[PDB]
Ligand binder design. Structure first.
Ligand SMILES: CCCCCCCCCCCCCCCCCC(=O)OC[C@H](COP(=O)([O-])OCC(O)COP(=O)([O-])OC[C@@H](COC(=O)CCCCCCCCCCCCCCCCC)OC(=O)CCCCCCCCCCCCCCCCC)OC(=O)CCCCCCCCCCCCCCCCC
Ligand SMILES: CCCCCCCCCCCCCCCCCC(=O)OC[C@H](COP(=O)([O-])OCC(O)COP(=O)([O-])OC[C@@H](COC(=O)CCCCCCCCCCCCCCCCC)OC(=O)CCCCCCCCCCCCCCCCC)OC(=O)CCCCCCCCCCCCCCCCC
Ligand SMILES: CCCCCCCCCCCCCCCCCC(=O)O[C@@H](COC(=O)CCCCCCCCCCCCCCC)COP(=O)(O)OCCN
Ligand SMILES: CCCCCCCCCCCCCCCCCC(=O)O[C@@H](COC(=O)CCCCCCCCCCCCCCC)COP(=O)(O)OCCN
Ligand SMILES: *P(=O)(O)OCC(C)(C)[C@H](O)C(=O)NCCC(=O)NCCS
Lengths: 34, 33, 253, 83, 245
């Protein structure tokens, strides 16, 4: 429902950014050594 | 009291804050290398 | 016996230098101790000999810059006390948590932590004093100017400091020990710098402001020049943006 | 649609105060921005910007240079108001 | 016990150059191809030394830089989003941060590599991006918070007031720290001089070009779209001219 999702859009965007960045970081953390 | 709580408290207790930071720095700098 | 980077390596290099240059060589010959382990030792022992000159040159520059910003000796002295106390608290806390083996330090994290702490402390002190003096130049009395300074700058200081403490804690996830060892100590030092800037700074301002004309402004005509810059920006923003991007392209190319 | 000359000067003088510092007691309809008030061409730009922001009176760049006195600005604003 | 044999290899020019580091993979490939089809095939090949260590450090440095950059840029975006309730302001600040960092490091590369002839040490990039990101976060947050708190009187008047108020302060702070970092040029150690002058040139360019003209210019172009998710007015409802005095 849009009325309540567009009220917490900042925490949702922060969560999306944190998730994407964390997955990309844990992916890059495996390139060294191998 | 029409002033916010945090700056009002930092302003009322201004000199104990300064002295507390002073003894903190003193201990932290003389009790360890 | 050591391991390039550790202190046992320098132990061993200086011990070998002692053994070698302890007894005289035959006439007409000289003996040296090279390798990328005596170079590292000499580099790490001359770095702290040049940093003792840098520690004086940076403060000699700080004092001049402070006198140029605030055309006043007492204001520069007050701000310098703020910065020095923040730096001292940061160094003490980090050296304490490293000495008691609570956190893992390094002789590179220290040289970077000093720089970051001085930067943050100077920035926050300038922010606080500048907001206070700007509110003072608009007519507000000392108490109203103190509260305007706090309400305008404290949350900025807190947010920026916590962002730096998080960014330089995410270095703990890197793989190189150079960067990996920067995470915890730099984050803790940032937390200490922020706590100092947000409690001791305002307290020093609230104490010194109630004596004579200590923190009263002098350079208020700089606000007018910066207002004229802002006017030029809001009137012709397109050309100014084109010029700025053209200047940035010089470096980006 | 007939904001009086005194009213326009009153609203303009409290922008001139914030921009420069000249008291509204000095802003009289015969003073020159360059000579008497000593207001450069870049402070006039922000006087015009703040006038447009506060009272909606838009003064372009080509017309801002030809307003030498305070009376010229008042006359410009009144003639713009007349439409 | 005779199960391992070792070879001591020397380079021709500088071992720690870009060529001496690229030679490590070639040495390993040559050793692997020499035992191909022999009774020694399938043996383990180990290569140690200084150029091998620096090859490993070279590979790891770029991934560590990417990790730190991703983390720092995401943290900066998050704090700009929390402070200014705006996606466009946060994205513009992140973009200007990236552009300023790039331009500053390019200017330092110019000054040192092309003019002075000395290349930049491999740690200068990391030590510079760390400090530059931190101080840029400081100064950008202080500017946009004032912008947000003053655009209520009009976006143009708000930008003028925010400049006159906080641009002075961020410029003073940036200049102070830039000139205390450029004081490292007196060191005998060229790596310290390079780090100091890189941070100093980066802060000079940043505070005198990017934060001084480019960020408020972008805020002025995008009038109400700088705060997009929030609905702001370009200017308030016009007021009537006040009664005299
Ligand atoms: C041991 C050795 C170690 C080495 C280090 C040691 C050295 C130690 C000593 C260091 C000495 C430096 C001392 C610094 C002084 C500190 C000043 C201070 O505290 O700050 C507040 C300071 C207050 O000044 P004030 O003396 O108190 O008086 C106030 C005015 O007089 C008020 O009077 P007014 O109202 O009548 O009007 C004047 C008004 C101004 O009024 C106006 O004129 C308005 C103009 C509107 C602009 C309209 C067109 C806009 C064009 C857009 C295009 C975009 C790009 C434009 C670039 C700028 C073009 C102007 O002035 C202002 O107040 C605001 C000035 C705005 C400044 C913006 C210009 C930025 C310059 C950017 C170029 C620099 C390149 C950076 C790249 C560096 C690369 C490494 O603010 C300033 O005025 C800025 C002055 C200094 C800022 C930096 C300028 C140079 C300083 C050093 C930089 C070195 C770079 C050289 C590189 C060479 C290139 C190849
Ligand atoms: C290492 C990578 C790590 C990550 C990198 C960093 C990641 C973050 C990226 C940063 C993102 C930037 C944020 C931009 C968002 C702003 C858009 C917005 O929502 O505002 C609405 C805004 C609407 O405002 P408006 O049109 O004025 O509304 C009409 C008014 O109501 C009434 O209209 P009026 O009567 O006032 O008429 C006048 C009006 C005109 O009114 C109109 O009707 C114009 C409408 C047509 C324009 C739209 C056409 C766009 C078609 C192309 C779209 C390109 C988008 C690219 C992807 C997004 C950007 C990344 O004049 C204007 O306002 C137009 C000027 C505004 C643009 C000026 C520049 C501001 C943009 C910020 C970038 C600064 C440029 C620096 C250059 C960098 C050089 C390297 O959108 C626009 O139309 C402005 C266009 C913005 C151009 C963006 C170009 C960015 C260039 C950088 C790209 C680099 C990416 C490379 C990635 C890596 C590749 C290797
Ligand atoms: C370097 C790391 C950077 C990573 C960051 C990635 C950036 C991705 C940006 C994605 C943009 C998504 C923003 C979501 C829109 C939020 C607007 C909304 O939902 O509510 C607004 C309502 O306004 C609207 O009605 C607009 C609705 C249209 C939204 C459509 C979403 C557009 C998605 C943009 C796509 C751009 C993706 C770019 C990806 C690179 C405001 O509500 P409010 O006033 O109650 O809350 C404010 C108080 N806190
Ligand atoms: C490694 C550990 C750290 C990890 C941290 C990860 C990243 C965390 C990100 C931190 C975000 C913190 C956000 C706080 C500032 C956000 C700015 C904001 O929300 O804007 C509002 C800010 O609102 C607030 O006031 C937020 C509360 C901040 C008050 C600051 C009080 C400082 C406390 C002094 C003691 C400091 C001791 C803290 C030690 C760390 C606008 O308020 P206003 O303009 O109306 O005026 C405010 C003052 N009247
Ligand atoms: P004043 O006589 O000093 O004139 C100043 C101004 C800046 C008003 C100038 O002469 C002018 O009228 N137009 C130039 C536009 C401009 O400055 N654009 C931005 C610089 S890229």
């Amino acid at each position: 429902m849009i009325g309540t999702l567009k009220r917490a859009w900042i925490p949702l965007l922060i969560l999306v950014v944190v998730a994407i960045a964390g997955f990309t970081v844990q992916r890059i953390r495996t390139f060294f050594g191998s | 009291a029409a002033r916010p709580f945090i700056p009002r408290m930092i302003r009322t207790f201004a000199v104990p804050i300064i002295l507390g930071w002073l003894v903190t720095i003193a201990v932290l700098n003389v009790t360890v290398p | 016996a050591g391991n390039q980077g550790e202190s046992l390596a320098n132990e061993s290099v200086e011990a070998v230098k002692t053994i070698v240059e302890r007894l005289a060589p035959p006439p007409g010959v000289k003996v040296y101790v090279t390798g990328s382990a005596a170079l590292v030792a000499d580099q790490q022992q001359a770095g702290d000999r040049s940093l003792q000159v840098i520690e004086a040159v940076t403060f000699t520059v700080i004092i001049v810059m402070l006198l140029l910003v605030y055309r006043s000796i007492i204001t520069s002295a007050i701000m310098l006390t703020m910065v020095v106390l923040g730096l001292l608290a940061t160094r003490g806390g980090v050296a304490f948590l490293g000495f008691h083996r609570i956190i893992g330090l390094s002789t590179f994290a220290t040289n970077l932590l000093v720089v970051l702490a001085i930067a943050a402390a100077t920035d926050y002190a300038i922010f606080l004093i500048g907001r206070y003096q700007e509110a003072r130049g608009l007519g507000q009395d000392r108490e109203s100017a103190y509260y305007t300074m706090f309400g305008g700058t404290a949350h900025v200081v807190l947010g920026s400091g916590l962002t730096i403490a998080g960014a330089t804690f995410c270095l703990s996830f890197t793989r190189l020990p150079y960067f990996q060892t920067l995470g915890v100590p730099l984050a803790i030092g940032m937390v200490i710098v922020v706590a100092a800037a947000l409690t001791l700074g305002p307290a020093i301002i609230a104490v010194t402001s109630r004596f004579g004309k200590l923190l009263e402004p002098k350079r208020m005509a700089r606000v007018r020049g910066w207002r004229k810059v802002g006017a030029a920006i809001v009137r012709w923003p397109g050309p100014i943006l084109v010029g700025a991007v053209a200047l940035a392209l010089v470096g980006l190319l | 649609m007939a904001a009086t000359q005194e009213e326009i000067i009153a609203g303009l003088a409290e922008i001139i105060e914030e921009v420069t510092g000249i008291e509204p007691s000095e802003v009289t309809p015969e003073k020159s921005f360059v000579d008497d008030l000593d207001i450069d061409s870049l402070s006039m730009v922000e006087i015009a910007v703040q006038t447009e922001d506060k009272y909606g009176v838009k003064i372009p760049d080509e017309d801002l240079a030809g307003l030498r006195t305070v009376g010229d600005v008042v006359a410009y604003i009144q003639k713009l108001e007349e439409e | 016990d005779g199960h391992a044999v070792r070879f001591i290899i020397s380079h021709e020019g500088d071992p720690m150059s870009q060529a001496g580091i690229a030679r490590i993979a070639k040495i390993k490939t040559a050793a692997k191809e020499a035992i191909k089809g022999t009774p020694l095939e399938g043996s383990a090949i180990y290569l140690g030394g200084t150029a091998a260590m620096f090859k490993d450090l070279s590979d790891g440095n770029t991934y560590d830089l990417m990790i730190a950059g991703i983390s720092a840029l995401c943290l900066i975006f998050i704090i700009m989003l929390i402070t200014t309730r705006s996606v466009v302001a946060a994205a513009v600040i992140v973009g200007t941060v990236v552009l300023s960092l790039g331009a500053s490091f390019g200017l330092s590369v110019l000054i040192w590599q092309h003019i002075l002839g000395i290349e930049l040490h491999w740690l200068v990039l990391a030590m510079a991006v760390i400090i530059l990101l931190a101080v840029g976060a400081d100064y950008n947050l202080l500017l946009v918070a004032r912008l947000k708190e003053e655009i209520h009187a009009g976006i143009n008047t708000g930008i003028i007031r925010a400049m006159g108020g906080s641009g002075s302060v961020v410029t003073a702070a940036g200049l102070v720290f830039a000139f205390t970092m450029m004081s490292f040029a007196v060191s005998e150690l060229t790596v310290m001089a390079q780090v100091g002058t890189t941070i100093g040139m980066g802060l000079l360019f940043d505070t005198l070009i990017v934060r001084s003209f480019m960020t408020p210019s972008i805020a002025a172009l995008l009038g109400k779209w700088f705060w997009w998710p929030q609905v702001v007015r370009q200017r308030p409802i016009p007021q009537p001219w006040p009664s005299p005095a």
